[PDB]
């Protein structure tokens, strides 16, 4: 499923993301945009460490979810990576919350540092009623 901008903004707010651990809704939108373009089925294989990034937030199998094929991986979100490919993003949001509870917070994702950190992210929530 490919989300429309404001549709997603409200979807995230309804799931308790607005200000979760100090992260504004605009920052979550910026992250989702740069990671998957608001697409829930997006995946990316990292041939080097044999891990895969899954879903709207492109969450990695080495540390966050279990796909059974990533060597020596852990499952901190305690979810099958399949849960990160559903149209309904509740599970993906629960896991993104788990990620930001770690030492780096929103900085956990390199894309956020590249395309969102120290930038104007207001555009993502403009006119969404959030």
């Amino acid at each position: 499923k490919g989300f429309e901008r404001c549709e997603l903004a409200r979807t995230l707010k309804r799931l308790g993301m607005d200000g979760y651990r100090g992260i504004s809704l605009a920052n979550w939108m910026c992250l989702a945009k740069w990671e998957s373009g608001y697409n829930t089925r997006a995946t990316n294989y990292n041939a080097g460490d044999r891990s895969t990034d899954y879903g709207i937030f492109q969450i990695n199998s080495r540390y966050w979810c279990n796909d059974g094929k990533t060597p020596g991986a852990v499952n901190a979100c305690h979810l099958s990576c399949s849960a990160l490919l559903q149209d309904n993003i509740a599970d993906a949001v629960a896991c993104a919350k788990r990620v930001v509870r770690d030492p780096q917070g929103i900085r956990a994702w390199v894309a956020w540092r590249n395309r969102c950190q120290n930038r104007d992210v207001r555009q993502y929530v403009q006119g969404c009623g959030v």
Side-chain angles (χ1 to χ4, degrees):
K1 156 171 191 175
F3 276 89
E4 296 273 44
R5 186 173 67 82
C6 291
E7 170 198 16
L8 178 63
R10 288 191 297 280
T11 299
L12 295 173
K13 192 180 180 188
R14 282 191 305 261
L15 288 169
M17 292 290 248
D18 191 339
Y20 182 86
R21 290 291 151 98
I23 308 153
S24 73
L25 207 58
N27 277 300
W28 288 116
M29 288 297 293
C30 187
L31 171 74
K33 175 61 161 191
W34 289 100
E35 289 296 353
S36 66
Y38 310 144
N39 163 21
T40 60
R41 297 185 62 237
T43 53
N44 172 70
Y45 185 59
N46 301 294
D49 81 323
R50 308 182 124 112
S51 70
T52 306
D53 301 314
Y54 294 89
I56 202 160
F57 295 122
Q58 288 290 269
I59 294 171
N60 193 262
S61 61
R62 175 157 300 289
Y63 316 99
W64 311 105
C65 64
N66 184 46
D67 61 4
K69 63 179 171 185
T70 307
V74 292
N75 183 11
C77 287
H78 298 97
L79 292 172
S80 161
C81 299
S82 171
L84 306 183
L85 292 176
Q86 304 175 73
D87 271 26
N88 180 282
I89 66 166
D91 285 328
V93 164
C95 189
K97 285 174 178 185
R98 169 62 185 96
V99 174
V100 309
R101 285 205 291 280
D102 248 24
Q104 289 174 285
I106 192 60
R107 288 162 163 72
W109 291 267
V110 187
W112 184 84
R113 302 178 217 163
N114 296 343
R115 319 287 189 159
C116 310
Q117 178 180 180
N118 294 151
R119 295 192 192 185
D120 187 328
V121 289
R122 291 179 295 149
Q123 72 174 255
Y124 298 101
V125 295
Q126 298 307 282
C128 302
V130 297

